[PDB]
Structure 1
Amino acid sequence: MDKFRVQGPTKLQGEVTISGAKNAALPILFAALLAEEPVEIQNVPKLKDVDTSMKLLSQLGAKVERNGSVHIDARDVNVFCAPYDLVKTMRASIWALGPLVARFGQGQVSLPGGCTIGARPVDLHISGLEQLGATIKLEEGYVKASVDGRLKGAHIVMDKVSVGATVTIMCAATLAEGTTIIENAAREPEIVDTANFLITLGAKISGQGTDRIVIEGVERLGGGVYRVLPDRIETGTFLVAAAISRGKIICRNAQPDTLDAVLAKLRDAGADIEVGEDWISLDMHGKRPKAVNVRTAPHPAFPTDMQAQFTLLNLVAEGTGFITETVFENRFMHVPELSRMGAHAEIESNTVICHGVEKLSGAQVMATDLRASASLVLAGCIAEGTTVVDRIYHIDRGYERIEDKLRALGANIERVKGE
C-alpha cells in the first residue's frame, strides 16, 4: 500500500490554482445520455472517480475521447448491463438510472458502495420513480426499469432533504412530459451549478437555490457549451492549513458566492478576509483562531460539506466548540485518528465536543474516508513528528497532484511505492 511521509514543521506561503469540481461534474456526465448532440465540457481534472466513469461509458457503446477538453458523444449506446466492479467503486453511480429509462427503455444498475459515510440513504431514489411512471422490479440486484413512453408529470411531496434525491429527480424530469414541482429540495451549491448546464441545452428550469422548484417538461433538446466551475471545498481546505501555521495564502479562480456563510464566521474571529470575483485572500496576523457553534444545515448557513475541514481548526483554537452533525451521523473516523496524536474529544449523540489544545505529535494514522483524508495530511505540516497516512488512494479521488501543489508552498512530501 502506498503511503506518504510529510516532515516539518515548515511554512505555507504562496499561491495555488484551484482545479475543477467533483460533486458538480458527476451529474453533468450523466445528463449527456439524453441529448443527441455532442456537448463540450471544460475544466475537468484527472481524478480517480473521473477516470472510472470514462471506462464505464466506454463499455456501454459510446466512444469517448479527451486530451485538452472533454467531448463525450453518447448517442450510440447499445449495452445496457453495467459491470459490478465499477458501480461498487463509487457512490454516485446510482444516479444513472434516470436517463436509462427516459430515452432508451431498459437498464440494469447494481447497488453502489463508495466510501463509508452512512447507511446509504437510497430510500428517496426509489420513491422518486414510482410517482413519475416506472415499474418496481429487480433481479439479482439489477434494478430493472421498463415503461412505454415518457415519464408523467406530478407533484412530488418529499419528507427529508438528502444529497442524491434532488439530482435523481432533476435528471429524470427534463424530457419527461408534464410539470413536476420538487417540494423541499436541496439548496446546496452543487444543484445551482448543475442547473446552469441544463439551461444551455434548452431546459426551462428557473428558481435555483430554493426548496420549491418548478421544472417545465419539454420534448427534446440538443447540445451546449458550458465550463465547469471550480470546486468550493478545495478553496476552503487550503485556508485551514494556513490558519494553523500563521501565514498568508492568495487563492486564484474561486467562487465567493458559493461560500457565503463559510467566510462570515471566520471574520469575527480576527482574520482579514478579502472578497472579490476571482481571488480570495486570508491572513491571521499571527493571532490564535477561535471556536464557533453553528449547527450543520443545508446551504446556506454553514453547509454540511465542511465537517472534516474545520475539525482540526477547532482543536487548535481555544475554548469549547461543538458542531451538531445531522447529515453524516455515521462518519466519525477522523476523531479516533486525531486522539492518538495527543488530543481529547467526545462524541455525544450526534454532536462532537471539540476542546482547545496547542500542537500535536505526528504518528501513524489511517485514512479510510474522502473528506477525512485531507485533515490528516495537513496536520503533519505543523506537528512535530513523522506522519504516516495509510491508504492514500482516497486523496487522488478528489484532488489531483496534491503533493505537487504543497511542494511549492513549503512542504516536504514524497510518494512511497507499495503494492
Structure 2
Amino acid sequence: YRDYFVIRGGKPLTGKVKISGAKNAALPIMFATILTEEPCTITNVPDLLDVRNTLLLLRELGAELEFLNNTVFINPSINSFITNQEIIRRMRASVLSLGPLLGRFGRAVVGLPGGCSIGARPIDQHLKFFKEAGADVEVREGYVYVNLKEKRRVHFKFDLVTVTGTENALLYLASVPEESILENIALEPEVMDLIEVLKKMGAHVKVEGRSAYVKGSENLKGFTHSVIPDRIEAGTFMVGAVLTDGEILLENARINHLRAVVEKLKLIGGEVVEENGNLRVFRKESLRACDIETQVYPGFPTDMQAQFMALLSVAKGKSRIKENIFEHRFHHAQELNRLGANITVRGNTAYVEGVERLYGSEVYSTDLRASASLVLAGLVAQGETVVRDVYHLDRGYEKLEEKLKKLGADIERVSEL
C-alpha cells in the first residue's frame, strides 16, 4: 500500500510511551514452535507486518494459530517443509524456518533470499553451517534443497558474527540429541531470548564468551514465553526525546539491552534516568557531534545508526558515523540531505556536519528500521515533512505514529492504496 505520514514539525515529545515486544525476538521464537508438536503460547508479541507474515508462513506450513492481544497461541501441526519464494521475498528472515524444518523432518525446501535494499546480504554462513552439520545442500529453481541423512553432533565456527545465522544453527541443534558446539556466535538480546525458549523446550544451552554448547532433544516440549521488549524501538524514542528537546518516560523497556545507545546519547547531550524500570529521557546539554561505529551487540546497533544520524544532523560539529555491519546502509543520509542536512558519504563512513535547522519536504522510507530516522527528522524540520511508503515502518514498529501522537507529535497518517 501507499500510505504515508505528514509530520508538521516543531513540538517537543513529552509524556509516557509503552515499548512493544521485540520483533526480532518474536520471529525466531515463533519459528522455534516448529520443533515441537505441543501447543505453545507467546506473549508480548508486537502486531506489525513481519510478525503477521511469519504467522502466515506457519499457517502455510500447517500450524493452527491465533493472534490476539499481542499473544500468539499455536498448535504446531506442521505438515509441510516448503517455505515458498514469495514469503522469502517479503521477508528474508523467513530463512529461519530452515533450521526447525530440518530438525523436524530431516529435509527442507526454502526459497533463497534475493538482494535487499540494506545490502546483498548473502546467507553463506547459514548454508555453510548446514553443510558442516552433514546435510546435502543444493540450490535449484531458486530454492535451497536440504536433506539430512542422519543427525549427528556438530562443531562449527562462524567466519563472521551473524544474528540469524546463529539462530538458525541453534534452532537445528536444539533438535539433535548430542553435544554440539558453536563458536563466534551473535550475543544479541534476541538471540539470548530464543535460547531461553529452546531451554524451556528441553534443550540444554550454555553460553560462554561467543561459544554456545548445545545438547538437543528429539522430544521437545511446548512452551509459554513473554518476549523481551524491543530495544530498537526504545532507542528510537530516546533519540526522539533528545532531538526534540522534550521529556519522555519509557515504560517496559530494559536498560540492560541499551548500554551502547545510552552511552552515545549522553555524549551527544542527552540524559537517561532510571526510575524503577522506567527510563526518563531528556536533553541535558546543547547537542554536540560524536563519532559512532556500528558493531555487533553489545556494541552500537546498526539498527540505531540512522536515528542517531538524524539527531547529529542538527548537533554542533562534524560527526563520523561508520558502518561495520551493513556498510551499504546509508540511503537515509541523502533523504536527510533533502531536509537541509549536510551529510557526506565516503565508502562505509558518513560524515555529518551539523546544521542549525532542517527544512521539511518529501522523503521516502526504504528500510523497516532505519527509515524511522526520517520520521524523527520530520519532528524538528521547519514546516512539513511527508514520509512516503510507511509500509516499511509498519514492518518494523508497532503503532509508531500513534505512540508519537500520544507524545505530542503533530503527525498523521494518510491511507493510500
TM-score between the two structures when normalised by the length of structure 1: 0.94
1:179-198 equivalences under 5 Å are 179-198=179-198
Indicate conservation of the 8 Å contact 1:115/1:370, yes or no: no
Indicate conservation of the 8 Å contact 1:89/1:114, yes or no: no
Match of 2:385 in 1: 387
1:109-124 equivalences under 5 Å are 109-113=110-114, 115-124=116-125
Indicate conservation of the 8 Å contact 1:90/1:113, yes or no: no
1:13 partnered with 2:9: no
Match of 1:203 in 2: 203
* Structure-2 separation of matches of 1:216 and 1:82: 27
* Structure-1 separation of matches of 2:184 and 2:84: 34
1:260 partnered with 2:259: yes
More strand by share: 2
Note the C-alpha offset of 1:291. 2.2
Please report the RMSD computed on the Cα atoms of aligned residues, expressed in angstroms.
1.8
SS at match of 1:387: strand
- Mean Cα displacement is larger for which, 114-123 or 344-353? 114-123
Note the C-alpha offset of 1:325. 0.8
Match of 2:319 in 1: 321
1:104-183 equivalences under 5 Å are 104-113=105-114, 115-149=116-150, 151-183=151-183
Q: Deviations over 1:324-346 (max 9, x none)?
A: 21111112200110112212222
1:39 partnered with 2:37: no
Match of 1:225 in 2: 224
* Structure-1 separation of matches of 2:258 and 2:391: 28
Indicate conservation of the 8 Å contact 1:256/1:277, yes or no: no
* Structure-2 separation of matches of 1:34 and 1:206: 19
Match of 2:246 in 1: 247
* Structure-2 separation of matches of 1:173 and 1:365: 44
* Structure-1 separation of matches of 2:323 and 2:20: 28
Match of 1:312 in 2: 310
Over 3 Å counting, the alpha-carbon distance change for 1:58 and 1:185 in structure 2 is same
Match of 1:359 in 2: 357
Match of 2:347 in 1: 349
* Structure-1 separation of matches of 2:356 and 2:185: 41
Indicate conservation of the 8 Å contact 1:188/1:303, yes or no: no
SS at match of 1:6: strand
Percent pairwise identity: 44
* Structure-1 separation of matches of 2:80 and 2:192: 32
Note the C-alpha offset of 1:30. 0.8
* Structure-2 separation of matches of 1:82 and 1:158: 24
Q: Deviations over 1:112-163 (max 9, x none)?
A: 34851111221101100111121122331222222233x2113213221123
Note the C-alpha offset of 1:269. 4.5
* Structure-2 separation of matches of 1:246 and 1:230: 25
Indicate conservation of the 8 Å contact 1:206/1:215, yes or no: yes
More helix by share: 2
- Mean Cα displacement is larger for which, 27-36 or 290-299? 290-299
- Mean Cα displacement is larger for which, 311-320 or 258-267? 258-267
Indicate conservation of the 8 Å contact 1:22/1:231, yes or no: yes
Match of 2:375 in 1: 377
Q: Deviations over 1:250-290 (max 9, x none)?
A: 110111111122212333454442135520112224x3122
Q: Deviations over 1:348-402 (max 9, x none)?
A: 2211111121211001111111223211112122211221112110111121222
* Structure-1 separation of matches of 2:388 and 2:267: 37
Which sections of structure 1, spanning at least 5 residues, go unmatched?
none
Note the C-alpha offset of 1:304. 2.9
Match of 1:57 in 2: 58
Note the C-alpha offset of 1:217. 3.2
Of 66, 71, 75, the match for 1:73: 75
Over 3 Å counting, the alpha-carbon distance change for 1:78 and 1:300 in structure 2 is closer
* Structure-2 separation of matches of 1:48 and 1:114: 20
Indicate conservation of the 8 Å contact 1:47/1:398, yes or no: yes
Q: Deviations over 1:194-240 (max 9, x none)?
A: 211122222111226x3112112334221222111110011110111
* Structure-2 separation of matches of 1:223 and 1:177: 17
Indicate conservation of the 8 Å contact 1:325/1:350, yes or no: yes
* Structure-1 separation of matches of 2:136 and 2:251: 48
Over 3 Å counting, the alpha-carbon distance change for 1:161 and 1:348 in structure 2 is same
Over 3 Å counting, the alpha-carbon distance change for 1:84 and 1:217 in structure 2 is closer
Over 3 Å counting, the alpha-carbon distance change for 1:266 and 1:415 in structure 2 is closer
SS at match of 1:233: helix
- Mean Cα displacement is larger for which, 166-175 or 130-139? 130-139
Indicate conservation of the 8 Å contact 1:183/1:213, yes or no: yes
SS at match of 2:262: helix
Q: Deviations over 1:146-189 (max 9, x none)?
A: 2233x211321322112322111111101213322111111222
Indicate conservation of the 8 Å contact 2:14/2:408, yes or no: yes
Amino acid at match of 1:74: P
SS at match of 2:305: coil
Match of 2:414 in 1: 416
Which sections of structure 2, spanning at least 5 residues, go unmatched?
none
* Structure-1 separation of matches of 2:175 and 2:81: 20
- Mean Cα displacement is larger for which, 57-66 or 232-241? 57-66
SS at match of 2:250: strand
* Structure-2 separation of matches of 1:158 and 1:289: 40
TM-score between the two structures when normalised by the length of structure 2: 0.94
